[PDB]
């Protein structure tokens, strides 16, 4: 039912409005119970997130507590590590750009609060290189914090030691991937590693490592301060907590609001943000989780509620919860076509399926926009789509297939007409 | 992806980190784990790019040298990332975001305007070697869709005219107020701040017990 209270809204400094710097942060009281929390114990911190039942705030959804629980296993003589990926290459994820730029501190204490939960020696934050100015803001914030002694050895007047670092991204969406963030951190080409050796057991510089969406790390302190329950209540069943929602494209006032999760899709454009540009009936389709997730047509939009599972039932993913909206004034065949162009210019090429498959769909999609291709080819694209969905080394091939599948699933008649239109003029 | 040695772009172009640059180089290493320097190739390669936009084959060889890594190792890193430029870069190097979010909100619109203003095709440097236009992909900051990153400036929410204004500012003078040239601060509902219009609770507000 959303409509979270301003007080409950974790990221108050969102939109700025309060000095993003430490003195603004102190009025925010972000560093209020940090010593106590760490003192309580690592086990106490994970109890808090397990009670919260928080889901991954990045595109993949998994219990946050269980993921952190995995490298809580005893150290084998290799320093455990924390990796925070501030890269958000996915379209519509200006979600993270806020916390980093507007409220850098929340993430800084998120890092050490999270750090003792996994017993990480240190945390590296991979902010996308594109955001150079953004980087300027966080290390100013990180510098403030150590000057204070909030972070560093004996951080926050406690036995525990932590050091936080910022790493430059270099314009790659794939760098974002969990195994590939590491390799970029390692300094090799940003190519996802394989799944069997999970990043807990192997990882950055070969030491145990864990990767979290910046929102996931940032919400940690509060979740512990407010307790898992407070946070647990807002969510729906497995779904829980407020997740920032970004609405971009064909809406009167595009904005990122951290309104509550489980929001009726019709409600968030209509009540907050801006009602769909041109009217709620001028909605050819909604992209709920960003480019990777399949778009849902207006038919079900109103009925839909914004939750990780909700969208699942709906065959779409909450993902980064980036709402991209397309009025009846857009050539979807071309809209999704540029997302496949978005993925051919970006996939690493390490795996055969994605390399040739994504390029193959790009060529077919460009012909589809022209209408040159015949109606029978459409099904092939579907078939090409699932070959790439289950065979890829990472999830990006997973992600490339879904928008193609969505276009065929709900807009098959329109593509046939574009097929028909070209055949008629010869 | 092949460096055919050319008089301009080839090692005859000597490269060496400024005494100041070399300094920058070392601290970075320490940022990474001890015994680990290879991990710094990217950050370093970035400072070679900071030094000079061209970053010629000579510059990458130096990077590998300073970082004691297989030279190819640096060559592979430079080729994989779009951030690094292996060819000369225009002083301004504007990049226009053309992913669906920006296109839906008119990103394409901007392009046509910029091509005419720079009076040049998309993808190459102006003769004046003043600006370089490229159709880059999602640069983040989508809520503000019309967008054109210029050396990190990241101007946002721009209407075609605005850019022309910006370009002129760049063409005569400098620092043309980089940022959203709109009336919305950072990202904010153009209407206002529905999320939080109240004052922020202070330190230790409703902090749960335990």
């Amino acid at each position: 039912f959303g409509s979270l209270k301003d007080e409950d809204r974790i990221f108050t400094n969102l939109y700025g409005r309060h000095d993003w710097r430490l003195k603004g942060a102190l009025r925010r009281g972000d560093w209020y119970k940090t010593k106590e929390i760490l003192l309580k114990g690592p086990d106490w911190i994970l109890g808090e997130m397990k009670t919260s039942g928080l889901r991954g705030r990045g595109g993949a959804g998994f219990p946050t507590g269980l993921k952190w629980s995995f490298m809580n296993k005893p150290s084998d003589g290799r320093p455990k590590y924390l990796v925070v990926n501030a890269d958000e290459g996915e379209p519509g994820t200006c979600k993270d750009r806020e916390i980093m730029r507007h409220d850098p501190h929340k993430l800084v204490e998120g890092c050490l609060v999270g750090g003792r939960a996994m017993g990480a020696r240190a945390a590296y934050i991979y902010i996308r290189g594109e955001f150079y100015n953004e980087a300027s803001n966080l290390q100013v914030a990180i510098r403030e914090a150590y000057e204070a002694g909030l972070i560093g050895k004996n951080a926050c007047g406690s036995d525990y030691d932590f050091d936080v670092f910022v790493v430059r991204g270099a314009g790659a969406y794939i760098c974002g991937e969990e195994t590939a963030l590491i390799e970029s951190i390692e300094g090799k080409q940003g190519k996802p590693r394989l799944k069997p050796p999970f990043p807990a057991d192997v990882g950055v510089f070969g030491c145990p490592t864990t990767v979290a969406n910046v929102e996931t790390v940032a919400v940690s302190p509060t979740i512990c301060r407010r307790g898992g329950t407070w946070f647990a209540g807002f969510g729906r069943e497995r779904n829980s907590g407020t997740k920032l929602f970004n609405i971009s494209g064909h809406v009167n006032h595009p904005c990122t609001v951290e309104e509550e999760m489980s929001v009726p899709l019709k409600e968030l454009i209509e009540k907050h943000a801006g009602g769909v540009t041109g009217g709620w009936d001028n909605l050819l389709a909604v992209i709920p989780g960003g480019s990777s997730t399949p778009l849902i047509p207006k038919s079900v939009c109103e009925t839909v509620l914004m939750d990780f599972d909700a969208l699942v039932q709906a065959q779409t993913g909450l993902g980064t919860a980036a709402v991209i909206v397309m009025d009846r004034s857009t050539d979807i065949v071309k809209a999704i076509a540029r997302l496949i162009e978005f993925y051919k210019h970006e996939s690493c090429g390490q795996c055969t399926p994605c390399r040739e498959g994504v390029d193959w769909m790009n060529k077919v999609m460009a012909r589809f926009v022209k209408g040159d291709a015949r109606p029978a080819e459409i099904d092939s694209l579907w078939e090409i789509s699932k070959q790439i969905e289950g065979h890829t080394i990472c999830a990006l091939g997973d992600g490339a297939a879904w928008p193609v599948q969505g276009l065929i699933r709900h807009f098959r008649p329109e593509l046939e007409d574009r097929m028909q239109r070209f055949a008629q003029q010869h | 992806f092949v460096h055919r040695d050319t008089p301009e772009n080839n090692p005859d172009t000597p490269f060496d980190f400024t005494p100041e640059n070399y300094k920058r180089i070392e601290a970075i290493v320490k940022n990474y784990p001890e015994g680990h320097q290879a991990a710094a190739v990217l950050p370093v390669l970035d400072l070679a790019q900071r030094q000079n936009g061209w970053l010629p084959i000579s510059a990458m060889n130096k990077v590998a040298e300073v970082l004691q890594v297989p030279p190819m190792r640096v060559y592979e890193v430079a080729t994989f990332y779009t951030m690094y430029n292996r060819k000369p870069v225009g002083k301004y190097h504007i990049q226009v975001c053309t992913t669906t979010p920006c296109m839906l909100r008119d990103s394409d619109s901007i392009l046509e305007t910029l091509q005419r203003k720079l009076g040049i095709k998309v993808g190459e440097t102006t003769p004046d070697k003043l600006f370089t236009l490229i159709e880059v992909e999602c640069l983040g900051a989508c809520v503000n869709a019309p967008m054109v990153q210029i050396n990190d400036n990241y101007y946002e929410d721009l209407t075609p005219k605005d850019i022309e204004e910006i370009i002129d500012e760049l063409k005569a003078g400098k620092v043309p107020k980089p940022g959203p040239r709109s009336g919305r601060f950072c990202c904010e509902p153009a209407g206002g701040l529905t999320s939080l219009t109240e004052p922020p609770k202070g330190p230790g507000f409703g902090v749960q017990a335990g």
């Binding site: 803001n137 050895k153 | 970075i28 320490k30 784990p33 015994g35």
Partner: peptide, 26 residues
């Protein structure tokens, strides 16, 4: 307007300044 103006070396040089704070290496 700190965001409004920063130099190309802000990130790196700021970091070097932070080096002193940076905890000892592994």
């Amino acid at each position: 307007l700190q965001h409004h103006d920063y130099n190309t070396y802000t990130f790196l040089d700021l970091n070097l300044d932070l080096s002193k704070f940076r905890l000892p290496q592994p």
